Motif scaffolding. Structure first.
Motif, PDB file in Angstrom:
ATOM      1  N   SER A 154       0.735  -0.818   0.242  1.00 24.91           N
ATOM      2  CA  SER A 154      -0.029   0.118  -0.220  1.00 24.91           C
ATOM      3  C   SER A 154       0.918   1.552   0.067  1.00 24.91           C
ATOM      4  N   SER A 155       1.984   1.299   1.046  1.00 23.33           N
ATOM      5  CA  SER A 155       2.927   2.538   1.369  1.00 23.33           C
ATOM      6  C   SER A 155       4.244   1.407   0.766  1.00 23.33           C
ATOM      7  N   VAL A 156       5.309   1.934  -0.275  1.00 24.12           N
ATOM      8  CA  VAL A 156       5.768   0.994  -0.464  1.00 24.12           C
ATOM      9  C   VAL A 156       7.107   1.981  -1.314  1.00 24.12           C
ATOM     10  N   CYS A 157       6.827   2.987  -1.816  1.00 23.06           N
ATOM     11  CA  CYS A 157       7.340   3.974  -3.055  1.00 23.06           C
ATOM     12  C   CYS A 157       7.979   2.356  -3.747  1.00 23.06           C
ATOM     13  N   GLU A 158       6.867   2.186  -4.572  1.00 25.31           N
ATOM     14  CA  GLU A 158       7.616   1.200  -5.620  1.00 25.31           C
ATOM     15  C   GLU A 158       7.790   2.014  -6.703  1.00 25.31           C
ATOM     16  N   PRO A 159       9.362   1.679  -7.455  1.00 23.36           N
ATOM     17  CA  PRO A 159      10.028   2.661  -8.813  1.00 23.36           C
ATOM     18  C   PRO A 159       8.763   2.457 -10.028  1.00 23.36           C
ATOM     19  N   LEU A 160       9.354   3.160 -10.741  1.00 22.42           N
ATOM     20  CA  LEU A 160       9.130   2.845 -13.246  1.00 22.42           C
ATOM     21  C   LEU A 160       9.835   1.655 -13.055  1.00 22.42           C
ATOM     22  N   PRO A 161       9.101   1.106 -14.162  1.00 24.00           N
ATOM     23  CA  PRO A 161      10.397   0.378 -14.642  1.00 24.00           C
ATOM     24  C   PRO A 161      10.889  -0.045 -15.129  1.00 24.00           C
ATOM     25  N   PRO A 162      12.177  -0.628 -15.883  1.00 23.03           N
ATOM     26  CA  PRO A 162      13.021  -0.198 -16.847  1.00 23.03           C
ATOM     27  C   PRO A 162      12.547   0.540 -18.727  1.00 23.03           C
TER      28      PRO A 162
ATOM     29  N   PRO B 138      -5.607   8.465  -2.039  1.00 20.99           N
ATOM     30  CA  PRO B 138      -6.513   8.393  -3.634  1.00 20.99           C
ATOM     31  C   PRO B 138      -5.361   7.932  -4.803  1.00 20.99           C
ATOM     32  N   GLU B 139      -4.820   7.621  -5.267  1.00 25.63           N
ATOM     33  CA  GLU B 139      -4.001   7.407  -5.673  1.00 25.63           C
ATOM     34  C   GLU B 139      -2.817   6.625  -5.268  1.00 25.63           C
ATOM     35  N   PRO B 140      -1.597   6.018  -6.040  1.00 21.56           N
ATOM     36  CA  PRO B 140      -0.452   5.334  -5.211  1.00 21.56           C
ATOM     37  C   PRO B 140       0.794   6.430  -5.009  1.00 21.56           C
ATOM     38  N   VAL B 141       1.505   6.217  -4.023  1.00 19.23           N
ATOM     39  CA  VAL B 141       2.373   7.314  -3.964  1.00 19.23           C
ATOM     40  C   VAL B 141       4.025   7.680  -4.998  1.00 19.23           C
TER      41      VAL B 141
ATOM     42  N   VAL C  46       2.857   7.966  -8.159  1.00 20.87           N
ATOM     43  CA  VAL C  46       2.292   8.774  -8.524  1.00 20.87           C
ATOM     44  C   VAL C  46       2.156  10.132  -8.613  1.00 20.87           C
ATOM     45  N   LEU C  47       2.045   9.780  -7.302  1.00 22.49           N
ATOM     46  CA  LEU C  47       1.593  11.010  -6.865  1.00 22.49           C
ATOM     47  C   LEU C  47       2.679  11.887  -6.229  1.00 22.49           C
ATOM     48  N   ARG C  48       3.696  11.627  -5.739  1.00 19.05           N
ATOM     49  CA  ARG C  48       5.241  11.883  -5.951  1.00 19.05           C
ATOM     50  C   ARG C  48       5.453  12.321  -6.882  1.00 19.05           C
ATOM     51  N   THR C  49       4.774  11.957  -8.428  1.00 25.21           N
ATOM     52  CA  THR C  49       5.933  12.207  -9.933  1.00 25.21           C
ATOM     53  C   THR C  49       4.977  13.516  -9.928  1.00 25.21           C
ATOM     54  N   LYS C  50       3.626  12.569 -10.092  1.00 17.39           N
ATOM     55  CA  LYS C  50       2.437  14.403 -10.722  1.00 17.39           C
ATOM     56  C   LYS C  50       3.468  15.900  -9.101  1.00 17.39           C
ATOM     57  N   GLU C  51       3.490  15.206  -8.471  1.00 15.97           N
ATOM     58  CA  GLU C  51       4.583  17.052  -7.597  1.00 15.97           C
ATOM     59  C   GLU C  51       5.276  17.161  -7.643  1.00 15.97           C
ATOM     60  N   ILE C  52       6.749  16.127  -8.718  1.00 15.22           N
ATOM     61  CA  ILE C  52       7.503  16.889  -9.205  1.00 15.22           C
ATOM     62  C   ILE C  52       7.262  17.322 -10.591  1.00 15.22           C
ATOM     63  N   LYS C  53       6.941  16.692 -11.797  1.00 19.00           N
ATOM     64  CA  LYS C  53       6.715  17.206 -12.951  1.00 19.00           C
ATOM     65  C   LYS C  53       5.412  18.654 -12.781  1.00 19.00           C
ATOM     66  N   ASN C  54       4.378  18.760 -12.072  1.00 16.63           N
ATOM     67  CA  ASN C  54       4.299  19.866 -11.700  1.00 16.63           C
ATOM     68  C   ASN C  54       4.686  20.933 -10.983  1.00 16.63           C
ATOM     69  N   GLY C  55       5.866  20.458 -10.139  1.00 20.60           N
ATOM     70  CA  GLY C  55       6.827  22.105  -9.865  1.00 20.60           C
ATOM     71  C   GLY C  55       8.087  22.133 -11.342  1.00 20.60           C
ATOM     72  N   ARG C  56       8.096  21.041 -11.730  1.00 23.07           N
ATOM     73  CA  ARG C  56       9.292  20.988 -12.566  1.00 23.07           C
ATOM     74  C   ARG C  56       8.461  22.112 -14.071  1.00 23.07           C
ATOM     75  N   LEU C  57       6.825  22.089 -13.683  1.00 20.39           N
ATOM     76  CA  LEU C  57       6.920  22.605 -14.206  1.00 20.39           C
ATOM     77  C   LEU C  57       6.863  24.175 -14.204  1.00 20.39           C
ATOM     78  N   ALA C  58       5.964  24.669 -13.266  1.00 16.73           N
ATOM     79  CA  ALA C  58       6.097  25.558 -11.925  1.00 16.73           C
ATOM     80  C   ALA C  58       7.795  26.237 -12.172  1.00 16.73           C
ATOM     81  N   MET C  59       8.665  25.518 -12.377  1.00 14.36           N
ATOM     82  CA  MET C  59      10.321  26.030 -11.788  1.00 14.36           C
ATOM     83  C   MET C  59      10.644  26.824 -13.187  1.00 14.36           C
ATOM     84  N   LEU C  60      10.522  26.332 -14.594  1.00 13.48           N
ATOM     85  CA  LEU C  60      10.548  26.756 -15.722  1.00 13.48           C
ATOM     86  C   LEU C  60       8.803  28.146 -15.795  1.00 13.48           C
ATOM     87  N   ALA C  61       7.924  27.890 -15.145  1.00 10.51           N
ATOM     88  CA  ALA C  61       7.440  29.569 -15.123  1.00 10.51           C
ATOM     89  C   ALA C  61       8.015  30.418 -14.678  1.00 10.51           C
ATOM     90  N   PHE C  62       8.708  29.462 -13.363  1.00  4.25           N
ATOM     91  CA  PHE C  62       8.892  31.240 -12.750  1.00  4.25           C
ATOM     92  C   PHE C  62      10.467  31.587 -13.570  1.00  4.25           C
TER      93      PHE C  62
END
Ligand code: CHL
Ligand code: CLA
Ligand code: CLA
Ligand code: CLA
Ligand code: CLA
Ligand code: CLA
Ligand code: CLA
Ligand code: CLA
Ligand code: CLA
Ligand SMILES: CC(/C=C/C=C(C)/C=C/[C@@]12O[C@]1(C)C[C@@H](O)CC2(C)C)=C\C=C\C=C(C)\C=C\C=C(C)\C=C\[C@@]12O[C@]1(C)C[C@@H](O)CC2(C)C
Lengths: 314, 219, 42, 212, 65
Positions: free
Chosen positions: D1-9, D158-161, D163-179
């Protein structure tokens, strides 16, 4: 025959050999037993004949090292053109090149060194340079700091180009000994192409840029209201009013009627009395004739076809 | 077997294995031994094909606005030569819906997506059918040759299902492409030596062929 | 970056970084407090 | 449930058909193999760079919010004379230098606690203990906690951990470039970001960076 | 240019005489259909040298006479 003869990825680009110092030899790639190790590291630093005992690796090393030196020279040229652009009195020197000291260096006012910024002239406080770069730029018909700035960016571009070329010709795709050992091609190209076409293209610059702009400046013209070189290229009426020999075109050249080209390729010996330099018509004729000479000279050695000479055969 | 200025070394790697192997390698560019970088006998074939295709588009898209414009079929405003269209602002400029540098950013971005993919297909051909590119990577996978991908997107029709017709079409491709590359060289040199369009040059040479090439370096 | 921090740890790279920082410090001090010959702050 | 499974190769990369580096297996969120230079070689330093990316992105997200939302309120008629790149020069109390040192004190406390988390994970623990209940040990940068996970969305509700951390990081990379766009195009246009958006949307062709 | 003139005649004859001196004469891969050698490189070589002689003689004739 003279093939291309290169190999892909002989040396891996990495900072592992940046870490271990003195990697390039047996007695230095161990570590400092003493402080003589440092001196022997720097002393044998470019002794490539001591590192690897084969002409292939040596030749690749010196080739990419020449690329690094060319990057450094282009970077230095970019620096001089840029300091002539933004930190110079080049316009004020063009307006009065007899009482305005050529200055292209300004110091920062920090510990009283601001007095090194002297009254060189032209509403400019700086160091009077002595490289004669202002004289080169008047011989090229520059007349603007924008042109010095853009050729400085171009020399930075060429410095990056030479650095990338050294990286490419050592680490990614390096020639082997069959490429360096052939010298008939190296001489043919460095004669016909480097020195032949180099003088040819400089004569083209002079015929198309230096002669008109310097004739305007000698006649007396503010360098701001002087026509640009591309206006001399495009607007034929302008350069034709400077030299009517241009009005006929290259049919003087291709019909070998060069006698009418003697308005801008004179053999007028001696110095220009108006400015004390040589006659730029004479210099354009010079570089043109030198181009013809080195172009016929760079077809002397046999490279890949039947005609030519062998340096061994000579 | 037709050899156009073949040599002793050119008949060591240009045997028959390429479209258009007339053995013409006098300088010795595509020699397979001792290769690297962009002077490779495969990359040079790819470069011939690609410069030939882009030159075919150039040749039948640079005189097309003048093949039509001197016959109607388009406004005279959008009937400029290849060089008075903003690609030589010293020589001419047309005003489109965007300035020329926005259009250059457009070209750069769209062709970047179009050609970095092509490049990564050159490196590993199996790619371009494994990443989610809006699902249209289904057709961008099938490569075979790198220069002749032949998928649903680039080769919708067969046009060379059999190897005989495909070989003849590849030969026709490279030959029309070499002709178009020489044509583009003619375009550049003619616009440089006359300052008018290539169709103007053709009409001036055809009608009353006086001073055909005698106008050396005169606009 | 591995083995770049070892190169930047080397004595000349580290010496030029330290002395560039130090020289900028002294330079900006002499801009702030130019022409100093006494320490009057006690 | 809460393991932080990585992305596949066989994950999507920044550059399709390219080889991902061996130091970007997929343990971090938003791992698309972006490493043309390879600044994350040392994994003990790539951890610090992942924390750097996370905090940088969170600050950039809050910042882009505090730039564009209040400008929308100014366009709606709530705030007067708003301009984020002149909102430090304008007047407040405390001179903007007392504000700076009070900020440095308070943010020094906060970011120092975060630093102590980074150096040694269990030092500054929060979400106080309860009898016969075990608060789960968190990861660096994702403390969970009663203060930062009060909705319990971090453990994977709501979602796996991942994909949520990836949401944080992608939305935030986009915000870094916006700034970065804010910091660049507010000085090469000397205007408002939302004004620049409406100006480009007026005529996308000729109202671009090349006009200025 | 101006075919038939002296500048054309004493250039054409120089180019053709150098091509002859390379073909059947004392002057000197790339397999051409020519009977005895004289490849494209040799052809361009003789043309270049004949143009050298032609420029030299036309301008020695334009200097005097
Ligand atoms: C981190 C930054 C980042 C960078 C530098 C790139 C770089 C690139 N990606 Mg990209 N990507 C990046 C993030 C990501 N990419 C992708 C997934 C893809 C795909 C699927 C494709 C690309 C492609 C490209 C190219 C498109 C650029 C272009 O067309 O001209 C840029 C034009 C200018 C700069 C104008 C200059 C004047 C370029 C090599 C395309 C390609 O390789 O071809 C392509 O098909 N990317 C994902 C999702 C996993 C990303 C996540 O953040
Ligand atoms: C095209 C030019 C050229 C090239 C490619 C080389 C190449 C080489 N030389 Mg030769 N050399 C040259 C010009 C050249 N040299 C000239 C002009 C001289 C006359 C001075 C010499 C005299 C010379 C000697 C006497 C020796 C070499 C040696 C070498 C080899 C190793 C050099 C090395 O590792 O030092 C790496 C670089 C350094 C250690 C830096 C040198 C520092 C200089 C001397 C200080 C001057 C800098 C500046 C002007 C002063 C102000 C500095 C400022 C910071 C205060 C290498 C093959 C050596 C060799 O092969 O022995 C086996 C050797 O013993 N060279
Ligand atoms: C950043 C890119 C990069 C990387 C990671 C590498 C990595 C490597 N190179 Mg390559 N190389 C590069 C760029 C790069 N190179 C470029 C751009 C060139 C062209 C010049 C070369 C040319 C080259 C040659 C010819 C050789 C290498 C070698 C090596 C290896 C040893 C490096 C070493 O110990 O020297 C580290 C040295 C430095 C960092 C010194 C930098 C010197 C620069 C070029 C000049 C600076 C001079 C400066 C302006 C004047 C002094 C001013 C001062 C007094 C203030 C290593 C694998 C060697 C090798 O593998 O052979 C065994 C080798 O022989 N490289
Ligand atoms: C006609 C073609 C040609 C030209 C112009 C040159 C020019 C040059 N060569 Mg030579 N070279 C040639 C053919 C040519 N080469 C051939 C055929 C071989 C193989 C036999 C070599 C082998 C050779 C060696 C082994 C070395 C050189 C070096 C040099 C440079 C000497 C420095 C100098 O004078 O700076 C004047 C500077 C300039 C004119 C600026 C150069 C800017 C342009 C972009 C590069 C010149 C064109 C070049 C050939 C690249 C072509 C395109 C490339 C993408 C393939 C000079 C740039 C030496 C050098 O400096 O090392 C780098 C060196 O070590 N060359
Ligand atoms: C490849 C290629 C490229 C880069 C271009 C590029 C261009 N074409 Mg050409 N064209 C091409 C192929 C190409 N064409 C082909 C294959 C045909 C057939 C045409 C027929 C054509 C016509 C008839 C016209 C253009 C025009 C134009 C310009 C405007 C394009 C536009 O509005 O969108 C631009 C310079 C227009 C122009 O001159 O502006 C115009 O009137 N093109
Ligand atoms: C060894 C002989 C010697 C001596 C004694 C001096 C002494 C001085 N020179 Mg001269 N000088 C010398 C050699 C010497 N110089 C040489 C060889 C050159 C040629 C390179 C010069 C060239 C030169 C110039 C061109 C100038 C000086 C200046 C000065 C003055 C320095 C003012 C300054 O910036 O310091 C200010 C103090 C510092 C930079 C030290 C700051 C250190 C840091 C901040 C740490 C300190 C705080 C620390 C944490 C402890 C706090 C305690 C506690 C709370 C922890 C001073 C009178 C300048 C001047 O004012 O002329 C009189 C000036 O313009 N000198
Ligand atoms: C604070 C900035 C920052 C930092 C530290 C990181 C750190 C990281 N990123 Mg992230 N990333 C960022 C911003 C950042 N990113 C932004 C803004 C984007 C969108 C453009 C991305 C997109 C991205 C992707 C798609 C991926 C990563 C990945 C990674 C990891 C490996 C790369 C690395 O170690 O670089 C360390 C980076 C730095 C130390 C910062 C660089 C600082 C130098 C001085 C250059 C700065 C100048 C810059 C080029 C200016 C921009 C110019 C403008 C015209 C664009 C690492 C965790 C990979 C990963 O595994 O994800 C977890 C991965 O696949 N990043
Ligand atoms: C010499 C006395 C001394 C000093 C210099 C510090 C210094 C510091 N403490 Mg410590 N602390 C002290 C005594 C001291 N403390 C004592 C006696 C206690 C009680 C046991 C604590 C309990 C404590 C906690 C619980 C925390 C600090 C934190 C901090 C940092 C605050 C960051 C900042 O600058 O904010 C302005 C700073 C490094 C904070 C920190 O960042 O920790 C890393 C934090 O969370 N301190
Ligand atoms: C929209 C971007 C975004 C997204 C998707 C996430 C997503 C996440 N964050 Mg991050 N975070 C962000 C921005 C974001 N955060 C910013 C800007 C900050 C700085 C204040 C933080 C500070 C932060 C901390 C300190 C912690 C998280 C935690 C979490 C996790 C649970 C909360 C959640 O699902 O948020 C959902 C987000 C939204 C629905 C956005 C709308 C909120 C509006 C503006 C109000 C999840 C991985 C926690 C975690 O991982 O615990 C294990 C945790 O401890 N984040
Ligand atoms: C890609 C290409 C052209 C692409 C053109 C395009 C996109 C044109 C676009 C436009 O026109 C339009 C549509 C509309 C205009 O309004 C705008 C522009 C933008 C202007 C040309 C390549 C053009 C490439 C050329 C001309 C290459 C010539 C190479 C030759 C002759 C090589 C000979 C040898 O290599 C061999 C065969 C064997 C060796 O051994 C010996 C030697 C002798 C070295």
């Amino acid at each position: 025959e003279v093939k291309i003869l290169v190999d892909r990825d002989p040396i891996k680009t990495s900072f592992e050999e940046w870490a271990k110092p003195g990697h390039f030899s047996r007695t230095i790639a161990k570590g400092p037993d003493t402080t003589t190790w440092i001196w022997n590291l720097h002393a044998d630093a470019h002794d490539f004949d001591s590192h690897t005992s084969d002409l292939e690796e040596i030749s690749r090393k010196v080739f990419s090292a020449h690329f690094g030196q060319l990057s450094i020279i282009f970077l230095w040229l970019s620096g001089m053109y840029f300091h002539g652009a933004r930190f110079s009195n080049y316009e004020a020197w063009l307006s009065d090149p007899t009482h305005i000291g050529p200055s292209a260096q300004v110091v920062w006012p920090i510990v009283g060194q601001e007095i090194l910024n002297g009254d060189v002239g032209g509403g400019f406080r700086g160091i009077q340079i002595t490289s004669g770069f202002f004289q080169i730029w008047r011989a090229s018909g520059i007349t603007s700091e924008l042109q010095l700035y853009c050729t400085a960016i171009g020399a930075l571009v060429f410095a990056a180009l030479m650095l990338f070329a050294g990286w490419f010709h050592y680490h990614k795709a390096a020639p082997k000994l069959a490429w360096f050992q052939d010298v008939e091609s190296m001489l043919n190209h460095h004669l016909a192409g480097l020195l032949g076409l180099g003088s040819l293209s400089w004569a083209g610059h002079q015929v198309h840029v230096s002669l008109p702009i310097n004739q305007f400046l000698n006649a007396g013209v503010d360098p701001k209201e002087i026509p640009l070189p591309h206006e001399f290229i495009l607007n034929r009426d302008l350069l034709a009013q400077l030299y009517p020999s241009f009005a006929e075109g290259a049919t003087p050249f291709f019909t070998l009627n060069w006698s009418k080209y003697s308005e801008f390729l004179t053999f007028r010996g001696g110095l220009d009395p108006v400015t004390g330099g040589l006659w730029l018509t004479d210099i354009a004729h010079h570089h043109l004739a030198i181009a013809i000479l080195f172009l016929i000279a760079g077809h002397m050695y046999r490279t890949n076809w039947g005609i030519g000479h062998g340096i061994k055969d000579i | 077997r037709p050899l156009w200025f073949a040599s002793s070394q050119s008949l060591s790697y240009l045997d028959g294995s390429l479209p258009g192997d007339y053995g013409f390698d006098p300088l010795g560019l595509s020699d397979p031994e001792g290769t690297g970088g962009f002077i490779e006998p495969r990359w040079l074939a790819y470069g011939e094909i690609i410069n030939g295709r882009f030159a075919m588009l150039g040749a039948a898209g640079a005189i097309a606005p003048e093949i039509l414009g001197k016959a109607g079929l388009i406004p005279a405003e959008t009937a400029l030569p290849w060089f008075q269209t903003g690609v030589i602002p010293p020589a001419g400029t047309y005003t489109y819906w965007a300035d020329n540098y926005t259009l250059f950013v457009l070209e750069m971005a769209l062709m970047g997506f179009a050609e970095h993919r092509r490049l990564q297909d050159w490196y590993n051909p199996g790619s371009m059918g494994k990443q989610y590119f809006l699902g249209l990577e289904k057709g961008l996978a099938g490569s075979g040759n790198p220069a002749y991908p032949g998928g649903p997107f680039f080769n919708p029709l067969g046009f060379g299902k059999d190897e005989k017709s495909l070989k003849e079409l590849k030969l026709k491709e490279v030959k029309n492409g070499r002709l178009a590359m020489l044509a583009i060289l003619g375009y550049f040199i003619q616009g440089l030596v006359t300052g008018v369009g290539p169709y103007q040059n053709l009409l001036d040479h055809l009608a009353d062929p006086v001073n055909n090439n005698v106008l050396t370096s005169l606009k | 970056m591995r083995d770049l921090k070892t190169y930047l740890s080397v004595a000349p790279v580290l010496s030029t970084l330290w002395f560039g920082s130090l020289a900028g410090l002294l330079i900006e001090i002499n801009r702030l407090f130019p022409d100093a010959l006494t320490f009057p702050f006690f | 449930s809460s393991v932080c499974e990585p992305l596949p190769p066989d994950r999507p990369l920044w550059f399709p058909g390219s080889s991902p580096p061996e130091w970007l297996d997929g343990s971090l969120p938003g791992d698309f193999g972006f490493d043309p230079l390879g600044l994350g070689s040392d994994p003990d330093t790539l951890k610090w760079f992942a924390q750097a990316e996370l905090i940088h992105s969170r600050w950039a997200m809050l910042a882009v919010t505090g730039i564009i939302i209040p400008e929308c309120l100014e366009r709606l008629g709530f705030i007067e004379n708003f301009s984020w790149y002149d909102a430090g020069s304008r007047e407040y109390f405390a001179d903007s230098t007392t504000l700076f040192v009070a900020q440095m004190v308070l943010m020094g406390w906060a970011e120092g606690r975060r630093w102590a988390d980074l150096i040694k994970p269990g030092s500054v623990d929060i979400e106080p203990k309860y009898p016969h209940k075990v608060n789960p040990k968190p990861d660096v940068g994702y403390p969970g906690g009663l203060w930062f996970d009060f909705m319990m969305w971090g453990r994977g509700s709501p979602e796996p951990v991942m994909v949520l951390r990836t949401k944080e990081i992608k939305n935030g990379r986009l915000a870094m470039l916006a700034f970065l766009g804010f910091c660049f195009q507010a000085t090469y246009t000397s205007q408002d970001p939302i004004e620049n958006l409406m100006a480009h949307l007026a005529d996308p062709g000729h109202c671009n960076v090349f006009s200025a | 240019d101006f075919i038939g003139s002296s500048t054309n005649l004493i250039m054409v004859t120089s180019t053709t005489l150098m091509l002859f001196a390379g073909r059947f004469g004392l002057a000197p891969g790339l397999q051409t259909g020519d009977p005895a050698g004289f490849t494209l490189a040799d052809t361009l070589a003789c043309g270049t040298v004949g143009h050298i002689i032609g420029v030299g003689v036309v301008l020695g004739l334009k200097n005097i006479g």
